[PDB]
Amino acid sequence: GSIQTLNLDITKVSYENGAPMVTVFATNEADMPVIGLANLEIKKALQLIPEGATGPGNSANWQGLGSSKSYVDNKNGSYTFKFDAFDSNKVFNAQLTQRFNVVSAAGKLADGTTVPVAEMVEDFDGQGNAPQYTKNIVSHEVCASCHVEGEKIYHQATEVETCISCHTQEFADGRGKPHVAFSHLIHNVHNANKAWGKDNKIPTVAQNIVQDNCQVCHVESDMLTEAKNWSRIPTMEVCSSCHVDIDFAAGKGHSQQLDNSNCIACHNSDWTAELHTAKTTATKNLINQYGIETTSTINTETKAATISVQVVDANGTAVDLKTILPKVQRLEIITNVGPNNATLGYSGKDSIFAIKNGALDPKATINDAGKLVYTTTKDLKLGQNGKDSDTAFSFVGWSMCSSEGKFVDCADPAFDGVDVTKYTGMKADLAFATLSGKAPSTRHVDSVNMTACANCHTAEFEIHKGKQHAGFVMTEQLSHTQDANGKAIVGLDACVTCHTPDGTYSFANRGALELKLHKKHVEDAYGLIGGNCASCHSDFNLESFKKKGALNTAAAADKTGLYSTPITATCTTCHTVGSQYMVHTKETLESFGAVVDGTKDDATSAAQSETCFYCHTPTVADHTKVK
Ligand code: HEC
Ligand code: HEC
Ligand code: HEC
Ligand code: HEC
Ligand code: HEC
Ligand code: HEC
Ligand code: HEC
Ligand code: HEC
Ligand code: HEC
Ligand code: HEC
Ligand SMILES: [Ca+2]
Ligand SMILES: [Ca+2]
Ligand SMILES: [Ca+2]
Ligand SMILES: [Ca+2]
Ligand SMILES: [Ca+2]
What we know:
binds calcium ion; eight-stranded mixed β-sheet; five-stranded antiparallel β-sheet; binds heme C; 22% strand; metal ion binding; alpha+beta; 19% helix
């Protein structure tokens, strides 16, 4: 017995007896009543002191009225709370909006049915009718873009409204700690200008992900009538969470301000909203000014691929590349072979910077039709490794020089790409070609896609922008299939051009794409992801292992490559053999057909000999499932 989702509604609030009597209705994912909840609670009862009541320009705030774990299970899905000690500070005011924060802890019903955590708030007027005014600024869904939904965020609770209901202005005042008011704390813990906590944690990682982008949490919504408060209510308490060097009382770094009465007179909402979003808006506008459309063909006699790139404008209209060439900062073409199991490796891939800082490489030209044309020079080895190897696949990344939201000429031929404020990575593309002339093979893209990456990195993620690459922006330009609803899938299959079964530049980095995203995020994003495979995966494509060969998993002492059979390679990125994270010894893994950090020849010969999926039946919901 398992409940997938526990829904909670406050269906009745009655003050006929003084202390409100509060009824909660609980249903499962099929809208059936849930009877026997043992850990239901009113975590907080609050009422809303309105905007400006504590002083001109001051925020609305939640005043505390108590809590209750005293309830009767009415045996029909409803539960009725009473308060043994309502409003112990005697501040109740029926003219104020009243809020109740209700939580149900994860656990089991008596019959043993598992029940997940549930949290909610609901607002009322002082007689239990609908409220007359609210403080609805954000909703819990924004946090779930980056923090695993249903798991605690730092501590105490899983939904932001529960945090807000405890981390109130009253709470902070009572502790003498302004910074623990939630509207200060929330920005503090994602911004690196000052540390937080007794251990003085500098939020370097949070800063690098959030980048002070107000729109990842402050989102327009008809559901949230105070959503524009992030620009409409400037206060020293909130604005100082990132602006940590101003002393408004002493007038250092800013004119003296003794209260919040005049902030809005100067910091008008238009300005605050615009200035904090200007650069991401400008960059997004530049990215969407141009596109590219790429084709590739194989010469059947020379077996080389010729890649042709058509620049287009925002409407899809052709743009002769000669007209914008002086502003093209880089354009790179990387070609590998065998999209389901790349065959050329990292050293054997074809790659060129066809353009650098306005200059065409001698190996690339612009034809009379205005297209860039380049022909591969490395041995593509087409058709030498089975049918999949009939297909070459080419990844095109490019960037354009830019300053303050405008494209500009690349005036410096030697510009090294380190200063990312001087250029914009643009929409990348992917082109297939076959030696036979038959339709190309393509890699599966049905298990991970860019929408998941964009939840944390935004859709404008300029992947690898810097000294080494132009920056790959991933979009429907390189989509070649749709999901069951007809939405174009933006895959990461182009990344395999470099993230090959042989690894990347070193054999020691688990560079194969099947390994690399796991390695980076289990090492550096575990606080956000943990074992939550759904953070990237809609499914696992276990059938894809039948198209895989050996995967590079280590470097030998002499720096040559060591390889594993592909399921073992994929699981061991997070489950290192010989570590506390892997119960199977090397010997046992070999008894299941695996090769573990052996030669490419041995791992290749044994690549379809692994018996792991006889026992293991992983799903995204539970990847640990075994028979
Ligand atoms: C992606 C753009 C995020 C959004 C949206 C939210 N959070 Fe966040 N948060 C993010 C990162 C990358 C980090 C650093 C993690 C690390 O391991 O260093 C954080 C950190 C926090 C913290 C600090 C404590 C911690 O768990 O590390 C808190 C308290 C926190 N985040 C809360 C939080 C809330 C309530 C959000 C919705 C309003 C929210 N975050 C959104 C990334 C992102
Ligand atoms: C009361 C029922 C709480 C709930 C709900 C939430 N938090 Fe909390 N938090 C609470 C206390 C008593 C404290 C210690 C405050 C102090 O005096 O130092 C905290 C502290 C934090 C912090 C540390 C802030 C800092 O040191 O600057 C963070 C980052 C934090 N809490 C986050 C947080 C989140 C994200 C919550 C909702 C998921 C949340 N808290 C709820 C009490 C309560
Ligand atoms: C998620 C990690 C956030 C980011 C990024 C930014 N804000 Fe935020 N803000 C967030 C929360 C959860 C809250 C509390 C809402 C509540 O109901 O209490 C806030 C609050 C503010 C406020 C206070 C508004 C008020 O009525 O007093 C302001 C002025 C504000 N936030 C501004 C702001 C700006 C300018 C940001 C980008 C630079 C920004 N926030 C980012 C969550 C997050
Ligand atoms: C962290 C999430 C922030 C919060 C909260 C607030 N601001 Fe901010 N501010 C932040 C950044 C990253 C920047 C630089 C933006 C850029 O692209 O250059 C700013 C900048 C300003 C400025 C202009 C700079 C100056 O020297 O004056 C102003 C006037 C400003 N911010 C005001 C402001 C107000 C009024 C805030 C509370 C509503 C506020 N900031 C919060 C980051 C963050
Ligand atoms: C008019 C007399 C103002 C009053 C009243 C308030 N602010 Fe201000 N502020 C004002 C200016 C002209 C600037 C510089 C703008 C620029 O782009 O250079 C600022 C700056 C700030 C900042 C940013 C600080 C920084 O990043 O260096 C913040 C966060 C800020 N101001 C907040 C703020 C608050 C909270 C106010 C009321 C207490 C307030 N300002 C009043 C002009 C004026
Ligand atoms: C939130 C749960 C994330 C998901 C979903 C994705 N990524 Fe991620 N990524 C995340 C964090 C916290 C970090 C560490 C950042 C730091 O400052 O240490 C990363 C790191 C990367 C990087 C490194 C480059 C960088 O800009 O930091 C890359 C190239 C990267 N992530 C790619 C990526 C891909 C392709 C994703 C979809 C499969 C993806 N990320 C999802 C957080 C999260
Ligand atoms: C060759 C031109 C590459 C392309 C195309 C892609 N990546 Fe890459 N990546 C490349 C190298 C040489 C390295 C360093 C060595 C290593 O294997 O770690 C990387 C690294 C990463 C990482 C690790 C974190 C980091 O260094 O940024 C990640 C998460 C990563 N690469 C992801 C990634 C994605 C999602 C790609 C397609 C959009 C992609 N890379 C393409 C070289 C090349
Ligand atoms: C984003 C940071 C990821 C998280 C979190 C997890 N996985 Fe993943 N996985 C990711 C990528 C980019 C790929 C490569 C896709 C490709 O084209 O090669 C994979 C691949 C797998 C596979 C192979 C089968 C497939 O669907 O392609 C497996 C079996 C797999 N991943 C398992 C897995 C598990 C069990 C995770 C939770 C512990 C998990 N992944 C998280 C990206 C990310
Ligand atoms: C990182 C992206 C992982 C990948 C790839 C795989 N697993 Fe995993 N696994 C991961 C975590 C973070 C955890 C939880 C560890 C904890 O104690 O919290 C697990 C756990 C398991 C388990 C259960 C633990 C045990 O001792 O058996 C199993 C059975 C398991 N994982 C299997 C498994 C398989 C078969 C994988 C390849 C298909 C695989 N995991 C990949 C993280 C990651
Ligand atoms: C049945 C005889 C199995 C075979 C065949 C394979 N595995 Fe297994 N595995 C099995 C069990 C009973 C467990 C423990 C489950 C638990 O919840 O305790 C595991 C565990 C793993 C793990 C997690 C290890 C850990 O977290 O310490 C991994 C990563 C794993 N197994 C991988 C794996 C591989 C790669 C296999 C084929 C070579 C394989 N298993 C086969 C049972 C069985
Ligand atoms: Ca209701
Ligand atoms: Ca909820
Ligand atoms: Ca901080
Ligand atoms: Ca295309
Ligand atoms: Ca077999």
